[PDB]
Amino acid sequence: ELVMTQTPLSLPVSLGDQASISCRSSQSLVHSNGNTYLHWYLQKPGQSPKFLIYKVSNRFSGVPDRFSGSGSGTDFILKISRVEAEDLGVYFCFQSTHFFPTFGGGTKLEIKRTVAAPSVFIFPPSDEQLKSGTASVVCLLNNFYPREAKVQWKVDNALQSGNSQESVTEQDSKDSTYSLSSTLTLSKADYEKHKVYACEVTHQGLSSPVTKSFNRGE
Amino acid sequence: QVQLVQSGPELKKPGETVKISCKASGYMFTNYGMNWVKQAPGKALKWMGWINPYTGESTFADDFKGRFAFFLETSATTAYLQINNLKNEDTATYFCARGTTIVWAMDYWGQGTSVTVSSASTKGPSVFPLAPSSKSTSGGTAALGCLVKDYFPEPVTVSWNSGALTSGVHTFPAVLQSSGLYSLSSVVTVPSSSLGTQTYICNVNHKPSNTKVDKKVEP
Numbered sequence: 001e002l003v004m005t006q007t008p009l010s011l012p013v014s015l016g017d018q019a020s021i022s023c024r025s026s027q028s029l030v031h032s033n034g035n036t037y038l039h040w041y042l043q044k045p046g047q048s049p050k051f052l053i054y055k056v057s058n059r060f061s062g063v064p065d066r067f068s069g070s071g072s073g074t075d076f077i078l079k080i081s082r083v084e085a086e087d088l089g090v091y092f093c094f095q096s097t098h099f100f101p102t103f104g105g106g107t108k109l110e111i112k113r114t115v116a117a118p119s120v121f122i123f124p125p126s127d128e129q130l131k132s133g134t135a136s137v138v139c140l141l142n143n144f145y146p147r148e149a150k151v152q153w154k155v156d157n158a159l160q161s162g163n164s165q166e167s168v169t170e171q172d173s174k175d176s177t178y179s180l181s182s183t184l185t186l187s188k189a190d191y192e193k194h195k196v197y198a199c200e201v202t203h204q205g206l207s208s209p210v211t212k213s214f215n216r217g218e
Numbered sequence: 219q220v221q222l223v224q225s226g227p228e229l230k231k232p233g234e235t236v237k238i239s240c241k242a243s244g245y246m247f248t249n250y251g252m253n254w255v256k257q258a259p260g261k262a263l264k265w266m267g268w269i270n271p272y273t274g275e276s277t278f279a280d281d282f283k284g285r286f287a288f289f290l291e292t293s294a295t296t297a298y299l300q301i302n303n304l305k306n307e308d309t310a311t312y313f314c315a316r317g318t319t320i321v322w323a324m325d326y327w328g329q330g331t332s333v334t335v336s337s338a339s340t341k342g343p344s345v346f347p348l349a350p351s352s353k354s355t356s357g358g359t360a361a362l363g364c365l366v367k368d369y370f371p372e373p374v375t376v377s378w379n380s381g382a383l384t385s386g387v388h389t390f391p392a393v394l395q396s397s398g399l400y401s402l403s404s405v406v407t408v409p410s411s412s413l414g415t416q417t418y419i420c421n422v423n424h425k426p427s428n429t430k431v432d433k434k435v436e437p
């Protein structure tokens with residue numbers, strides 16, 4: 001039973017630079033009939049895989065020219081030269097020489113770009129939500145890079161703990177930024193005990209922390 | 219062109235059977251292999267096996283020897299996967315993919331069917347406007363959205379203005395809270411000038427619970 005190894009697991013590259021994902025294999029992928037049945041797929045965030053390369057070194061139709069594959073026997077490279085924003089995704093090698101066909105573990109290609117500062121927003125809970133008996137406050141950080149961002153909640157100028165949640169998007173396919181949401185969740189009663197709600201964002205792009213807030217019942 | 223369109227999300231108790239389908243079009247169905255690939259959350263793809271629709275015959279990879287079957291309906295060009303006596307290990311996304319036999323590789327893939335195995339009962343979301351704060355009077359870009367709250371299982375599907383507003387939209391990964399349930403937000407950015415022009419509806423479908431909801435997001 002063959003093993004199909006990919007390196008790295010995670011490959012940061014900047015735009016225009018070249019990228020090498022490699023894929024080793026426990027045993028030769030040459031069929032006794034003469035061919036090598038090594039292929040590559042790209043799986044973009046959320047989507048189903050895309051056919052890239054077949055039989056080691058062939059671009060599938062529609063696949064741009066800056067993707068190329070090579071190698072022989074046990075060692076294969078996929079090279080994306082002049083990398084672009086939409087090359088973002090997970091690359092898998094697939095062998096079907098020996099039964100049974102197998103996938104590498106995938107390499108996550110990450111785009112490196114210049115720092116970009118977040119646009120910060122805040123949304124009070126909706127009337128509708130209150131009616132049902134809870135308050136959720138949402139703080140949006142839009143279009144930033146790098147991923148790292150410290151989001152803090154001040155409720156009436158007191159810091160909060162373990163009562164909010166963060167979610168981050170995958171890297172953007174055109175500009176390679178991230179977006180994030182922090183959600184403070186209080187009970188309707190708790191929410192009404194206070195008046196000022198604020199998320200303060202700290203981030204590499206900001207020369208000093210930006211605070212967004214509101215007073216209740218606006 | 220070649221299209222493989224698979225059936226919706228499924229929620230099944232452990233021990234039950236599931237049957238997922240995959241309808242093919244835009245080519246001679248019987249002439250190409252049909253492969254099935256498993257994808258557990260954040261994990262790599264796994265090749266389960268294929269059915270040869272010209273002989274009706276199935277091959278499975280070692281792990282999927284056992285509780286797994288492939289079926290065909292050539293007349294209707296559909297292929298099926300059936301898993302039975304379901305376990306939590308089966309919670310995953312399942313892909314059918316056309317097997318282009320001339321080079322021994324899958325070329326066209328279905329969009330993926332997501333199956334949750336859980337002892338727990340479907341719970342449908344509540345949807346709340348995340349209402350924009352920028353007065354239409356002033357400049358810049360304003361932000362707005364929907365809080366899709368307290369549902370199980372994954373996934374829910376958010377679109378805006380019936381999928382005719384896609385630019386500037388961010389639908390966040392679902393996240394868990396101590397309740398055992400999921401929540402997310404879909405936000406969009408728009409010129410503040412247009413908030414007093416035209417309307418913004420977010421359209422949330424959650425199929426395991428049969429909730430389709432539209433929410434008018436406004437000041």
Ligand SMILES: CC(=O)[C@H]1CC[C@H]2[C@@H]3CCC4=CC(=O)CC[C@]4(C)[C@H]3CC[C@]12C
Binds near residue numbers: 099101251253318323
């Ligand atoms: C090894 C062998 O005899 C060959 C004959 C036909 C080949 C199969 C043809 C269909 C096919 C399509 C795929 O996408 C995976 C590889 C497979 C599953 C092939 C694997 C190797 C097979 C099974």
